[PDB]
Q: What sequence folds into this?
């Protein structure tokens, strides 16, 4: 029972994929259809959905929530979840290098942390692409 | 707690920044959908 | 001038097509269409 | 006199084999934690735990073979 | 009661032998037996060059030869009566010192002041600074001996264990079930003894880490 | 058995290093 | 004529690689100490 | 003298583990070592995969050379022939 | 007396391999929790686990080499 | 009698490497779980693991050097 | 016989350096697992890691110095 | 012989400091992971680490005093 959907598009509703990996804020986690119930905050990265069948899916997602209850119902909510093909690897590298260049530009600690979020998202994008 | 959290950045701002990065990562072919998802219509009354 | 350049390009294309020969060529022979560089070049 | 030496060595040697007991304990405890996180006994968790316990007990039995060489 | 003997025959012929095991053809397409060697070389070179990412990558073309040589010498020792050159402490001692000296002198050749400043871990408690400094310099001087021993001792110990258990099997004229069990233990150990390649990886990776730290 | 002497074992390894690096320099990706 | 094959690499990395003189000195000192024992 | 050893090594390489290299490449593809792993006189060596006959021969030669070297130290059990 | 010393020294030295057994147990246990948190077994999760097992086995055999030298 | 004392002392000094094995096992075991939690191994996540191995194996080789000095 | 006891006491005394290795391995592995969560290596994290490593190594070398004093 | 007994006892007694070193390493490493989890470092996170380190050092010092009593 996998509930994966963006605010605009729906990927999986009650799907028995039984295996989902999420880029959590603290790190990475793996759902195994029996994983301990927990609430996990998403991090810039890609959700590699592994269905019960041998086929798998790879979607790069924005921040969000990984809500796996005591049961198998997992409600994965990603703000901007798209497949890797829609993205551009060249634009990915360009954005990463520009963000690295502008990291020191933001004198404010909060603003530099925001640009650090940007560079982290671009690095995860580069690794995914 | 991270570099962004407990330093003046709300988690909603974190989500906005990463979502904008993902939208910019999209090619111009899918940029229309990203613009559609991007909501700047709501303004502020104070 | 463009016709002369076109003749040169056609000659080069014919030479490339004919010089392919067997795939089991020499490493130095492959430099005709794909040579290496000097030192401090192959970064990866 | 050499029999006394063999007795002392066998006494000292066998402790090394028992020190591996903590290793299998750590293996089984980490198995506890892993099964607590993602409960699936047929998964590679049990196989990895068995392999770790087997390696630790192999170290212990190799130390015990050294002890037997001391005895003989 | 059989005395173990890591004897010293005419070393040069034995040591030069692993070199002849790798042919280098000058052809666009290799001989499907050097090709696997080339693929392994590329795969290991990528791993070794990933960390450096500096002008010190020139050293990688020699570290590849180093890892190939150590692996070839140690893998050949698993043969029945092969004499491991790396069993003797002499050659590994003669390998550890020059390369560590090369790393430290390369560090002292460029950005020398900061190279010596690597002893400072960016501040740390001043009350324990002399203790930390003496500890880290004693560790740095230990490092070559550590690198040599962590190869010599276990390379010798693998052969020592093989000899011991083999002599136990040969002397075991008792119940054949015990002999079969000990032979199974022998084969399991020899499969584990094939992990001497991991020892090559550890040696070369420690050398790479030291070089990257100092350059 | 135990390693002693240490004279010619540590001398042939440098020549073998030269040979190995010369051989692998011909290897290319 | 195998020298020219790795001549550039030789002086390229031995600027500090060719410190085997330290190894030779250590080996000679150890041999002298052992001969004193011998 | 050494020229003869070099020629022998080249012949061994061509026979097992073998532009003009196209002939050498076809010779390696044929795999005369693969046909007879134990030379033409015998049938084959125990290993029957990977076209590893030449490497097996080299390793066996090295093993027998080291056995000849080590025969000096080792000693037999009985003067009478073993069972 | 000397043979007694050989036996007692070997029996002592072989007890030092217990720490390596504890180390291999610890690393192989941590393998299972790493696998449970991230199902990437064929990756560096198991690669570095094998590396650590080899390193600790080296630390143990390089210890028992002293016992082997003492016995002979 | 001094040779016997050197033998037993070297045997006892050899057992001081067990802590080195426990330390290397613990550090590499924590390395695997750290990589499992955060897939950024190529960084300090593995550099400090190698550094900890280097700084923890020092005790074992120090103890074995002491054992060799006692033996010889 | 007094020199024999000095040898055996020096051999038994250096065993205490084992705990230093285990402690250093533990502290460095803990540094690894902590950095796995908080990417703040260039902070008081590595500072306290170095502090703990220095304390453990100092304890081990103090035990080694006691062993040397016993030897001499 | 009595001085020989004092030497061997002092050599055996001082090994108790190894556990103090292991405990110190564990304390500092757990302090590392605790600060990694929560940034309240200047709070009692450091105080509890100091408390553990002091108690481990006290145990090691008591073992050292026992060794001194054996020696004298």
A:
């Amino acid at each position: 029972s996998f509930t994966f959907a963006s605010p605009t598009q729906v990927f999986f509703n009650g799907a028995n994929v039984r295996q989902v990996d999420v880029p959590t804020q603290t790190g990475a986690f793996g759902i195994l259809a029996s994983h301990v119930p927990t609430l996990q905050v998403l991090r810039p990265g890609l959700v590699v959905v592994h269905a019960e069948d041998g086929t798998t899916s790879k979607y790069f997602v924005s921040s969000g929530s990984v809500t796996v209850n005591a049961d198998s119902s997992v409600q994965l909510l990603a703000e901007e979840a798209v497949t890797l093909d829609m993205l551009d690897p060249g634009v990915a590298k360009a954005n990463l290098e520009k963000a690295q260049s502008e990291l020191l530009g933001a004198a404010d600690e909060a603003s530099r942390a925001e640009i650090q979020i940007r560079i982290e998202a671009n690095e995860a994008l580069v690794k995914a692409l | 707690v991270a570099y962004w959290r407990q330093a003046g950045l709300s988690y909603i701002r974190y989500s906005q920044i990463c979502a904008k990065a993902v939208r910019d990562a999209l090619k111009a072919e899918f940029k229309a959908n990203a613009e559609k998802t991007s909501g700047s219509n709501v303004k502020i009354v104070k | 001038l463009s016709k002369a350049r076109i003749e040169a390009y056609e000659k080069e294309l014919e030479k490339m097509k004919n010089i392919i020969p067997f795939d089991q060529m020499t490493i130095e022979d492959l430099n005709e269409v794909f040579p290496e560089t000097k030192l401090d070049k192959k970064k990866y | 006199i050499d029999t006394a030496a063999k007795f002392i060595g066998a006494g000292a040697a066998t402790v090394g084999v028992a020190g591996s007991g903590a290793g299998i304990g750590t293996v089984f405890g980490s198995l506890i934690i892993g099964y607590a996180r993602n409960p699936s006994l047929k998964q590679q968790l049990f196989s990895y735990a068995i392999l770790g316990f087997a390696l630790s007990e192999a170290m212990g039995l190799f130390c015990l073979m050294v002890a037997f060489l001391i005895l003989f | 009661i059989a005395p173990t003997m890591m004897g010293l025959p005419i070393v040069t012929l034995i040591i030069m032998f692993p070199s002849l095991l790798f042919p280098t053809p000058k052809r666009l397409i290799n001989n499907r037996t050097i090709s696997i060697q080339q693929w392994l070389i590329q795969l290991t070179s990528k791993q070794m060059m990933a960390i450096h990412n500096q002008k010190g990558q020139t050293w990688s073309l020699m570290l590849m030869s180093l890892i190939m040589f150590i692996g070839s010498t140690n893998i050949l020792g698993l043969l029945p009566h092969s004499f491991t050159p790396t069993t003797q402490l002499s050659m590994n001692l003669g390998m550890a010192i020059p390369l560590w000296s090369a790393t430290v002198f390369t560090g002292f050749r460029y950005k020398t002041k900061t190279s010596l400043a690597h002893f400072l871990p960016q501040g740390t408690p001043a009350l324990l600074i002399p203790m930390l400094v003496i500890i880290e310099t004693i560790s740095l001087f230990i490092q070559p001996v550590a690198l040599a021993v962590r190869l010599t001792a276990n390379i010798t110990a693998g052969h020592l264990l093989i000899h011991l258990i083999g002599g136990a099997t040969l002397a075991l004229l008792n119940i054949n079930t015990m002999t079969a069990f000990i032979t199974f233990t022998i084969l399991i150990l020899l499969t584990i003894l094939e992990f001497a390649v991991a020892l090559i990886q550890a040696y070369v990776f420690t050398l790479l880490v030291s070089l990257y730290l100092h350059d | 058995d135990t390693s002693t002497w240490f004279i010619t074992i540590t001398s042939m390894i440098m020549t073998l290093f030269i040979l190995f690096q010369l051989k692998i320099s011909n290897y290319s990706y | 004529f195998q020298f020219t094959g790795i001549k550039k690499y030789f002086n390229s990395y031995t600027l500090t690689g060719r410190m085997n003189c330290v190894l030779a000195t250590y080996g000679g000192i150890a041999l002298l100490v052992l001969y004193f024992k011998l | 003298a050494s020229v003869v050893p070099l020629k022998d090594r080249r012949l061994l390489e061509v026979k097992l583990g073998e532009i003009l290299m196209r002939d050498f490449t076809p010779s390696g593809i044929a795999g005369a070592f693969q046909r007879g792993y134990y030379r033409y006189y015998n049938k084959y060596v125990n290993v029957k995969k990977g076209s590893v006959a030449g490497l097996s021969m080299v390793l066996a030669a090295y093993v027998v050379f080291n056995y000849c070297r080590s025969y000096k130290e080792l000693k037999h059990e009985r003067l009478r022939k073993y069972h």
Helices of chain F lie at 9-26. Chains F and B do not touch (no CB pair under 8 Å). The first helix of chain F runs from residue 9 to 26.
